[PDB]
Ligand SMILES: C=CCN(Cc1ccccc1C(=O)N[C@@H](CCC)c1ccc(OC)cc1)Cc1ccc2c(c1C(=O)O)OCO2
């Protein structure tokens with residue numbers, strides 16, 4: 001549970017926003033890329049796993065599950081690469097709702113920056129700090145610290 | 150102290166590696182940019198503060214301390230922007246040593262990727278996971294979890 005993350009790819013402004021969600025907390029990291037490719041997804045997972053103890057990643061689609069470059073990055077970084085089949089049907093709903101909430105936040109900040117990437121990092125900040133009471137950033141630290149002890 | 154980070158800029162391959170160090174743990178995040186500017190440093194701090202609870206940042210030089218774009222990002226993200234004067238002289242030394250260790254790790258991995266940015270994220274991963282017994286990634290989670298509770 002503490003080490004499981006889900007990839008999610010959504011689109012805005014003709015660009016792709018790649019998101020990693022820590023499933024147990026709802027904490028996210030995200031980036032804007034011009035298109036989803038294996039190399040961009042592999043680089044994103046390398047960043048993520050140097051920053052949090054990523055044990056398992058559920059990939060977002062079959063092309064990133066198949067990609068040799070993504071499998072190579074997961075080898076390099078010690079991540080178990082898994083498919084992202086929603087065996088629990090509640091799961092695609094949770095992801096869908098997250099994409100809608102993120103796009104809502106992006107719209108609320110959009111005029112505060114020229115570049116979409118800046119708006120997306122403002123939305124990551126607001127999402128991770130929102131108290132639901134604990135925020136997702138607090139939840140992820142508590143879960144992982146509890147795992148370490 | 151759980152919320153204090155130090156900026157650090159080092160150079161390699163004619164490019165700039167911008168590093169944020171969580172001072173109490175030694176955990177780092179880093180990126181490669183073509184040159185240090187206010188806009189790049191501001192964007193880097195916006196990413197960092199969406200991911201960890203960044204209360205104070207000691208800037209790496211006077212140009213980033215003066216920059217109104219950097220001050221604006223620190224406003225946006227709730228960070229107190231401070232100078233980085235090494236009132237404790239041991240601080241100079243610790244940062245210098247870290248830059249030498251990072252460059253050493255980058256050389257150990259450099260042939261495993263074409264682009265310097267990939268080598269620098271491999272180095273961030275090795276640095277944060279190295280046990281010296283706890284790693285810096287474990288220390289930062291413990292410190293922040295202790296602070297939440
Ligand atoms: C002079 C800087 C260039 N722009 C100017 C701008 C252009 C259009 C609209 C608003 C603004 C504006 O000044 N907004 C303020 C917030 C106002 C409430 C703001 C300040 C610092 C900040 O730092 C992260 C983010 C936002 C901001 C910017 C900075 C760094 C970046 C960017 C961008 C970008 O515009 O996307 O892209 C990647 O690195």
Ligand SMILES: C=CCN(Cc1ccccc1C(=O)N[C@@H](CCC)c1ccc(OC)cc1)Cc1ccc2c(c1C(=O)O)OCO2
Pocket residue numbers: 039040042043046069070072073076260261262263264265267268
């Ligand atoms: C076909 C992919 C392009 N290259 C090929 C390459 C070129 C030169 C030398 C080695 C290799 C090589 O295959 N290395 C393996 C490890 C071998 C032990 C590797 C695999 C996945 C990985 O994912 C993060 C990192 C490394 C890797 C790469 C991927 C994604 C990126 C990159 C780069 C880059 O080369 O910098 O830049 C930004 O996004």
